[PDB]
C-alpha cells in the first residue's frame, strides 16, 4: 500500500507523521547525573512518539511485528540523533535537545565521554546547514534510517521496495527545486553519505549510554534498558 503512492503523497504522509517536539524539565547548572537524567528522560518520552511515527511511515505496518521491533531496536538512537541534528540546524554551535534545553559544547564536558559525541552531532548539524537541508528531505532520510539500518541484520524485499520509493521521492524533491540531473544524484549521494556518520554517532552513543549504566550514574527506564540490551 506504500508502493502505489505518488512522490508528493509520500512527502505529505511523512510530513503528517512527524512526532512532536517534546520539552525538558524547566529549571540549575548541570552535573553529570542531572544532565544524563534530562537526556534519558527526554529520550524515553520521545521513544513513545517514535513508535507511533514509525507505524505511520508508509510500508512499516506491512512488516511483521518482529521485523518492526528489529528495525526500531537497531535504529532508535540514530532516529533520535538525526532529529536532534535537524532541530539544531538553526542554532549553530548548540544542540537543541528540547526548546528549553539548548546545550553548546562546554556543557557537554559535564558528562565524561560526552563532549566527543557533541562535536560529532554539531558537525552533522553544521553539514545539514551547509547543504541547506529541507524538511521534506529530512523526513525521507529519517524514515530511510528506520527501514535501512536493520535490514541486513535479519520481507527484506518489501523493505528495499519501500526504500527505492523514498529514493524516487528524494529525487522528485530535488527535481522540483530546479537542480539539474547531475546535481540531483550528487545531492542524493551527499545526503545518504551522512547516514554513515549518523550510524557512527549512534554506536558511540550506545556504548556511552551503556557506560553510564555500568557506572550507575543515572537509573535508566525499563524501555531504554530494553532498547539498549538489543545491542552489543
Amino acid at each position: 500500500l506504500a508502493l502505489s503512492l505518488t512522490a508528493d503523497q509520500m512527502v505529505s504522509a511523512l510530513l503528517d507523521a512527524e512526532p512532536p517536539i517534546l520539552y525538558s524539565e524547566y529549571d540549575r547548572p548541570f552535573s553529570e547525573a542531572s544532565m544524563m537524567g534530562l537526556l534519558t528522560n527526554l529520550a524515553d518520552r520521545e521513544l513513545v512518539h517514535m513508535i507511533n511515527w514509525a507505524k505511520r511511515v508508509p510500508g512499516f505496518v506491512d512488516l511483521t511485528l518482529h521485523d518492526q521491533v528489529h528495525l526500531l531496536e537497531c535504529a532508535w538512537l540514530e532516529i533520535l540523533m538525526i532529529g536532534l541534528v535537524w532541530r539544531s540546524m538553526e542554532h549553530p554551535g548548540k544542540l537543541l535537545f528540547a526548546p528549553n534545553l539548548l546545550l553548546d559544547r562546554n556543557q557537554g564536558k559535564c558528562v565524561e565521554g560526552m563532549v566527543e559525541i557533541f562535536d560529532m552531532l554539531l558537525a552533522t548539524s553544521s553539514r545539514f546547514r551547509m547543504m541547506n537541508l529541507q524538511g521534506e528531505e529530512f523526513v525521507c532520510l529519517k524514515s530511510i534510517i528506520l527501514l535501512n539500518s536493520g535490514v541486513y541484520t535479519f520481507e527484506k524485499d518489501h523493505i528495499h521496495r519501500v526504500l527505492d520509493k523514498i529514493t524516487d521521492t528524494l529525487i522528485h524533491l530535488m527535481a522540483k527545486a530546479g537542480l539539474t540531473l547531475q546535481q540531483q544524484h550528487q545531492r542524493l549521494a551527499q545526503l545518504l553519505l551522512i547516514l554513515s556518520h549518523i550510524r557512527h554517532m549512534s554506536n558511540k552513543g550506545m556504548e556511552h549510554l551503556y557506560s553510564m549504566k555500568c557506572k550507575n550514574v543515572v537509573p535508566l527506564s525499563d524501555l531504554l534498558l530494553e532498547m539498549l540490551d538489543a545491542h552489543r
Binding site: 513508535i51 521491533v69 524501555l223 530494553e226
Partner: peptide, 10 residues
C-alpha cells in the same frame, strides 16, 4: 515479553 511489542500494537 517486550515493552516495544506493546507500544507497536496499540
Amino acid at each position: 515479553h517486550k515493552i516495544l511489542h506493546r507500544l507497536l500494537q496499540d
